[PDB]
C-alpha cells in the first residue's frame, strides 16, 4: 500500500492530467488559504489536489502558500510586467478555481499545439543515425538497398580483397 | 504575528522583553568557546592594522599635496 | 518511515563491496613457499593438501591444491583462483591444475 492519503496524487498520470499551462507572463502564484473554516473548503482542496498539477506543468513558476493569515482564501498572481492579479476563491469549488485561473491566465489549446509541432521540427524520418534520434541507423536496413555485409556476405567482385587480387594479377 | 500593535503595548506595559528565536542553534563547549574568542580577536587585530595603515597612507598623500 | 523521512534520507546507504583473496581479479600468480597439511573441521576427517604462496600482489596466502596427488615443491610457480574450501577455515584460494608448474592430475 502506497503511503499517505490519496496516493494517486503521487503518480505521473495524475500530475499530467493538469490542464492549466500559464502564460509566459505568470511568474509567481501565492496561495492564501485557511486550514479551519467552512467557506474555505474549496481552497483547502485546491491546495491538496490541484497545486501539484499546476506546478508539474509550470515548473518555473514559484508557488508559495501561506496559511491562516487572512479571514478569506485568495490567489494572487505576479506577472512579469509588474501587474498583480488577485483572485478570490471563497465559496468556490476546487474545480471552479482551476477553471477560473485557466481562463484568465491559461494558454489556449491552439497555442500549445503550435509549440509541440515547432519542437519536433528537426526530427526527420528520412534521417539516419542512432536509434535514440532516428528510425534507421543505415541504408542497409531499407528494403531493396544493398544489405549489411555482416548479415549477408557481399559478392566477391564487390570486395576490396578481391579487387586487389585482380590488380596484382593484371 | 497576528496583532503587532497589541503585542507592542503588552510588552511595554508588562515590561517583558521579547527576543526572536535564533535561526541556527549554536553548540557550546570549552574548545569551541576558546577558538571562537580567538577568531574574533584575530579579526579585530587585522582590521585595526588596516585602519592604521589607511591613516598613515592618507597622511603621507596629504603632505605631498 | 514517513514520506517526509524517506525524502530527507533518500535511497538506502549501501556498504561497499569489499574484495576477497584475489582482490577482484580472476586469477593470481604466486610462488610456492611451503607445502603442508591442513585438518578439516569436525565432523570432516582428512589430511587436505595445501600450500602457502606469495602472490604477485605481495601478500602471502594459503591455497588448497585440488586433485589426487600433486608434485608441487618450494619455488614452484602456480596460478591461484578464488573459491573457498568449505571444511578448511581460512583457505580462500585454490590452485589451477594444468598451468605453469602445476600439472593435471595424473590419471593412473
Amino acid at each position: 500500500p502506497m503511503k499517505g492519503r490519496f496516493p494517486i496524487r503521487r503518480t505521473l498520470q495524475y500530475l499530467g492530467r493538469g490542464d492549466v499551462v500559464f502564460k509566459e507572463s505568470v511568474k509567481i502564484m501565492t496561495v492564501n488559504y485557511n486550514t479551519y473554516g467552512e467557506l474555505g473548503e474549496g481552497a483547502r482542496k485546491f491546495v491538496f489536489f490541484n497545486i501539484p498539477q499546476i506546478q508539474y506543468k509550470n515548473p518555473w513558476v514559484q508557488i508559495m502558500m501561506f496559511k491562516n493569515m487572512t479571514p478569506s482564501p485568495f490567489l494572487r498572481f505576479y506577472l512579469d510586467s509588474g501587474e498583480q492579479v488577485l483572485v478570490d476563491v471563497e465559496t468556490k469549488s476546487n474545480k471552479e478555481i482551476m477553471e477560473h485561473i485557466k481562463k484568465i491566465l491559461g494558454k489556449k489549446e491552439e497555442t500549445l499545439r503550435e509549440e509541440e509541432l515547432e519542437k519536433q521540427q528537426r526530427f526527420h524520418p528520412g534521417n539516419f543515425g542512432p536509434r535514440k534520434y532516428c528510425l534507421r541507423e543505415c541504408m542497409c536496413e531499407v528494403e531493396g538497398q544493398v544489405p549489411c555485409p555482416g548479415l549477408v556476405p557481399l559478392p566477391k567482385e564487390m570486395t576490396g580483397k578481391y579487387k586487389a587480387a585482380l590488380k596484382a594479377s593484371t | 504575528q497576528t496583532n503587532y500593535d497589541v503585542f507592542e503595548k503588552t510588552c511595554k506595559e508588562l515590561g517583558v522583553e521579547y527576543t526572536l528565536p535564533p535561526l541556527h542553534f549554536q553548540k557550546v563547549h570549552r574548545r569551541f568557546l576558546a577558538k571562537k574568542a580567538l577568531c574574533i580577536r584575530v579579526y579585530q587585530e587585522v582590521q585595526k592594522l588596516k585602519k592604521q595603515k589607511r591613516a598613515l597612507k592618507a597622511a603621507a598623500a596629504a603632505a605631498k599635496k | 518511515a514517513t514520506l517526509n523521512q524517506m525524502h530527507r534520507l533518500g535511497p538506502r546507504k549501501e556498504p561497499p563491496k569489499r574484495l576477497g583473496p584475489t582482490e577482484g581479479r580472476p586469477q593470481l600468480k604466486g610462488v610456492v613457499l611451503r607445502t603442508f597439511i591442513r585438518k578439516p573441521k569436525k565432523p570432516n576427517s582428512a589430511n587436505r593438501k595445501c600450500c602457502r604462496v606469495r602472490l604477485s600482489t605481495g601478500k602471502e596466502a594459503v591455497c588448497f591444491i585440488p586433485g589426487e596427488g600433486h608434485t608441487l615443491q618450494e619455488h614452484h610457480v602456480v596460478l591461484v583462483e578464488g573459491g573457498r574450501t568449505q571444511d578448511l577455515p581460512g583457505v580462500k584460494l585454490k590452485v589451477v591444475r594444468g598451468k605453469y608448474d602445476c600439472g593435471h592430475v595424473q590419471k593412473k
Binding site: - | A34, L38, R41, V42, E45, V46 | -
Partner: protein
C-alpha cells in the same frame, strides 16, 4: 536467555581486563589528553598566522582546557 548471559560474560571479562591494566590506561589517557591539547594549540596558531598576524592577539594565552583544572 544466552544473550544477556553473554553480555554479562562479555562485560565481566572487560571489567577484569580493565582492572589488570588500569595503571597502563591511566598513562595512556594523560598522554592522549596532552596530544589533544597540543593539537588544540596548533590549530589556534594556524588561524592567526594565516590571517597575517605574526604574534598572537595581545593579552591572549591559549586556555588549558584538557588539564586537571576542575
Amino acid at each position: 536467555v544466552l544473550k544477556i548471559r553473554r553480555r554479562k560474560m562479555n562485560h565481566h571479562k572487560y571489567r577484569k581486563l580493565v582492572k589488570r591494566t588500569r595503571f597502563l590506561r591511566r598513562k595512556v589517557r594523560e598522554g592522549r589528553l596532552k596530544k589533544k591539547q597540543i593539537k588544540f594549540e596548533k590549530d589556534l596558531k594556524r588561524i592567526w598566522l594565516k590571517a597575517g598576524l605574526k604574534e598572537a592577539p595581545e593579552n591572549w594565552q591559549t586556555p588549558k582546557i584538557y588539564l586537571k583544572n576542575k
